[PDB]
Amino acid sequence: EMLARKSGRLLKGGEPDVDGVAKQVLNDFMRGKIPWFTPAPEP
């Protein structure tokens, strides 16, 4: 909701577009725009 209000992803009546913002976040996660990794197991 805060990401939608900040980025202006609003439906009619100023309601936040939580669906579209979730799709944006998932796409950024998959396409290497958010840093993440699985650490290797310690020997």
Partner 1 sequence: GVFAKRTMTKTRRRLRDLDQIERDLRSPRHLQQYKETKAAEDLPGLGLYYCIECAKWFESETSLVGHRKGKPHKRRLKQLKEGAYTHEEAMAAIGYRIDNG
Q: What is the contact surface with RNA in residues (CB under 7 A)?
A: 6-14, 17, 19-20, 23-24, 27, 31-33, 35-39
Chain centroid offset of residue 31 CA: 12
| Closer residue to partner 1 (CB): 11 or 26 | 11
**20 contact partners, CB below 8 Å, separation of at least 6:** 4, 9
10 Å Cβ neighbour count for 2? 8
Binding partner of 41, given RNA, partner 1, none, CB within 5-8 angstroms per partner class: none
Residue 1's binding partner among partner 1, RNA, none (Cβ under 5 to 8 angstroms by kind) is partner 1
